[PDB]
Amino acid sequence: MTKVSSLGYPRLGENREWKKLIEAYWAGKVSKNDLFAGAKELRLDFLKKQLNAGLDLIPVGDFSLYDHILDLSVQFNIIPKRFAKEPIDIDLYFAIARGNKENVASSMKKWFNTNYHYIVPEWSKQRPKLNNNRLLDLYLEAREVVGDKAKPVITGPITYVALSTGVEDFTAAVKSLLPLYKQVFTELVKAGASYIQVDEPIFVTDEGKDYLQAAKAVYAYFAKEVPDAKFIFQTYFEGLIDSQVLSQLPVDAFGLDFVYGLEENLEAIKTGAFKGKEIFAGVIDGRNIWSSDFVKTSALLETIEEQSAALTIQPSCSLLHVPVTTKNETDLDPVLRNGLAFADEKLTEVKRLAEHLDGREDPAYDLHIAHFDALQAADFRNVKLEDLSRVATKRPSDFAKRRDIQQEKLHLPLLPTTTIGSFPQSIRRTRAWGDISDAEYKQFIQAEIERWIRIQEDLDLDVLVHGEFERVDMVEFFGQKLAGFTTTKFGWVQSYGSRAVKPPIIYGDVQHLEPITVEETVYAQSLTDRPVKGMLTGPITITNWSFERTDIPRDQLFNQIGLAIKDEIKLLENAGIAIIQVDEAALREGLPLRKSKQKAYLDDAVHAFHIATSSVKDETQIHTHMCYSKFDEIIDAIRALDADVISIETSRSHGDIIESFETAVYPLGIGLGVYDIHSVPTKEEVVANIERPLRQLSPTQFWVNPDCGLKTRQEPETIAALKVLVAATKEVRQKL
Ligand SMILES: [Zn+2]
Ligand SMILES: [Zn+2]
Ligand SMILES: [Zn+2]
């Protein structure tokens, strides 16, 4: 009676066969025939899983060999000018994604506030035309497996245009795509399509508010030209903006996110503005991995049902954003695993919620709730942590007074040189310990640390780092030793192209129990008489890169992690480490979509940082690394962190990134990333980068260092770049 659906499914496959397949093709190890056969096997496999879960409308079209936006580019003839000569085939497809020997790749940007990156369209004089029948082929293919349950999906024109680059005139660009979409949809209906999911997440965002009338024109058009289609104006990631206006779109159904846009959408329907329309209700978390709260969700569905003409139940976004399945996670505690749900498990949940709304009895439903309740009641979610009322949130002495005390203890030269902490890893082959004694691995890493310690000494870098050779992930390396964290055996998620990450799971209260990084850091320091830095990851990054608990508020979690970082920082200081660097490279990525919610997030972020760093002695020097760009946004927050030194990337802007610190008269220490760690710098090239920020703020305030970590670069080029860095700095010193 009540339909269930889904927006999308991962491409990976249970053991990353998709990743191995496309990567093998690029390496010339897999023919075209085996590429497409392999990709077909996967699709059919995925269609069956979704069929067997009981879905009434199974998403078809989101499967891709790299990216769903890129798919539209090639399909709509939006191909970068530099590739305009190539034949339009899969090699050109991958050429745009990865670049060939003559042309660089298209750029990629973040898919909203997710961990996924899409490939950015590059508009030019090119006339939009259909270059294939990609979506029709996929649809007809699916029909043979699932039949009338097949639901074509596609990113809408407005969102596609907004995510693009080079668009001179927005409505003209959008308008030129309409006839293509018309043909696409008309072919699908002819082939038997009914419901067609048309994604417009842009209408959950601030920017979206500029396009309300474009939405009216575009969908009035589709409704006039393809009258037989049942369109699903599909949004996700936040609430529907201007819901009272958009609710008037001439479309059959609306896809609302009741997980990340609960309150806004909830009040959008209580108005009775969707009583004449069908709601596709995003009620299962598509970006996280906890089993649903069935009581909560069922009661929610009842309210939605009475406020709509028809209800269809689905996850809040494409399952693209979660791992495939918990079935093979055999190392997990049963009380935890029975409280987890990845992609496949969510298909089952969505089915069971509908059957319970239709008043069908199923033992699985109450059993699900029982397993849900056990997890909540577990000891690990009831850990007694340090009392926050007995924990400092503000350092005893302010910046100015600390700057003196520290200078008296460190006597670092004007414009000290240093690095963001990490050095190139060669060996990964050694780590496979595979089986090798621990006293061998340690001795191995320690030999490598000494080596680089001498290197930095010769280069005359006055603040050293151990290299982090023992670290493969800046988050999981901590998650491995913090209680309340666990890793998975197979929880992979696509981040961009053939890259995937396997994020930790914060399943319980977070608690520091043992030294995490102290050993390596203390060793390095014993070798030299120059200051060695400790490197840690702040709570923001740790949360954003992990699958976080959803049963406790963001700020509470932040504080828990802050406490652990505090306890680890204590250990470091105890051991004699005098400079400690807290890295936050996810602050941007974790920023809420809506401008109206960013301040509360930043406040949570700043407080937790204070929890982490306010219990150090005045002499101990607190550094924070932030690989961001638009600092003007978070400037107040940054100044709020009260870091002795904050290092940025000024190389890309040639040094003009200081503008925000200039306006805000930043009185704290600033590290200058004067070399892109992604791309050999010239000596005259680096000095200019250094002197730029010297315009307003005083020189006694700056540090010279690379843009970010060096794990990306090769040792040869790394050493050469550092030589130039130190030379450029020394030079600007002589000129006083
Ligand atoms: Zn990423
Ligand atoms: Zn009930
Ligand atoms: Zn505070």
CA distance 496 to 97: 10
Q: How far is the CA of 15 from the centre of ligand 3 (A)?
A: 44
Say how far apart CA 17 and CA 104 lie, in whole Å: 27
Long-range contacts of 208-212 (CB under 8 A, 24+ apart): 208/162, 208/241, 209/241, 209/242, 211/158, 211/162, 211/170, 212/241, 212/242, 212/245, 212/246
Has 471 been labeled as part of a binding site? Answer: no
User: 366: CA distance to ligand 2 center in Å?
Assistant: 10
Give the strand order in the sheet containing 579-583: 464-465, 532-537, 579-583, 621-625, 645-649, 669-673, 702-705
DSSP for 284-311?
E-SSS-BPP-HHHHHHHHHHHHHTSSEE
Q: Are strands 108-110 and 253-257 parallel, antiparallel or unpaired?
A: unpaired
Which burial class, exposed, middle or buried, applies to 315 when counting CB atoms under 10 A from its CB (0-12, 13-18, 19+)? buried
Domains of the chain with CATH codes: 1-377+489-503 (3.20.20.210), 378-488+504-736 (3.20.20.210)
Q: How far is the CA of 538 from the centre of ligand 1 (A)?
A: 17
Taking the C-alpha atoms of residue 715 and residue 723, their distance in angstroms, rounded to an integer, is: 12
Distance 402 CA to ligand 1 centre (A): 36
Q: Helices H, strands E: what count in the chain?
A: 25, 21
DSSP state of 103: S
Q: Is 649 annotated as a binding residue?
A: yes
Does 708 appear as a known binding residue?
yes
* Angstrom distance (rounded) from CA 530 to CA 545: 33
Q: Solving technique for this entry?
A: X-ray
Q: By CB neighbour count within 10 A (0-12 exposed, 13-18 middle, 19+ buried), where does 127 fall?
A: exposed
Query: How far is it, in rounded angstroms, from Cα 109 to Cα 165?
Result: 11
- Taking residue 90's Cβ as centre, other Cβ atoms within 10 Å add up to 14
Which ligand is in closest contact with the Cα of 301?
2
Ligand 2 midpoint to CA 295 (Å):
8
CA of 490 to the centre of ligand 2 (A): 34
Has 304 been labeled as part of a binding site?
Answer: no
Write down the residue that tokens 């949360």 correspond to.
543
Residue 225 neighbours by CB distance under 10 Å = 15
Q: Is 421 annotated as a binding residue?
A: yes
* 115 assigned to a ligand binding site: yes
Catalytic residues: 678
374 C-alpha to ligand 2 centroid (Å): 19
Q: How many CB atoms lie within 10 A of CB 237?
A: 23
Q: Which of 138, 103, 102, 99 is nearest to 119 (CA)?
A: 99
- How many residues belong to the chain? 736
- Cβ burial of 288 (10 Å; 0-12, 13-18, 19+) is middle
Ligand nearest to the CA of residue 640, numbered in listed order: 3
* Cα separation, 439 vs 431, whole angstroms: 13
Q: Is 155 in a helix, a strand, or coil?
A: strand
Give the resolution in Å: 2.4
Distance 116 CA to ligand 1 centre (A): 6
Q: What is the dihedral of CA 513, 516, 518, 523, to 10 degrees?
A: 140
Beta-bridge mates of residue 532? 464
Known binding residue 492? Answer is no
CA 443 from centre of chain: 35
Ligand closest to CA 611:
3
Question: What are the beta bridge partners of residue 315?
Answer: 284
Ligand nearest 388 Cα, by number?
A: 3
Give the relative orientation of helices 170-191 and 134-146 as an angle to the nearest 10 degrees: 30
Q: Which residues contact 443 (CB under 8 A, 6 or more apart)?
A: none
Distance in angstroms (rounded) separating the CA atoms of residues 652 and 673: 9
Which residue in 45, 60, 50, 47 sits closest to 4, CA to CA? 50
Query: What is the secondary structure of 375-392 as a DSSP string?
Result: HHHSGGGS--PPPGGGS-
| Cα–Cα distance measured from residue 286 to residue 5, given in angstroms and rounded to the nearest whole number | 13
499 is in an annotated binding site: yes
Quick one: 460 exposed, middle or buried, by C-beta within 10 A (0-12, 13-18, 19+)? middle
User: Which amino acid, one-letter code, is at 288?
Assistant: N
Q: Which residues surround ligand 1, an ion (CB under 5 A)?
A: 495
Ligand closest to Cα of 608 equals 3
Taking the C-alpha atoms of residue 216 and residue 251, their distance in angstroms, rounded to an integer, is 10
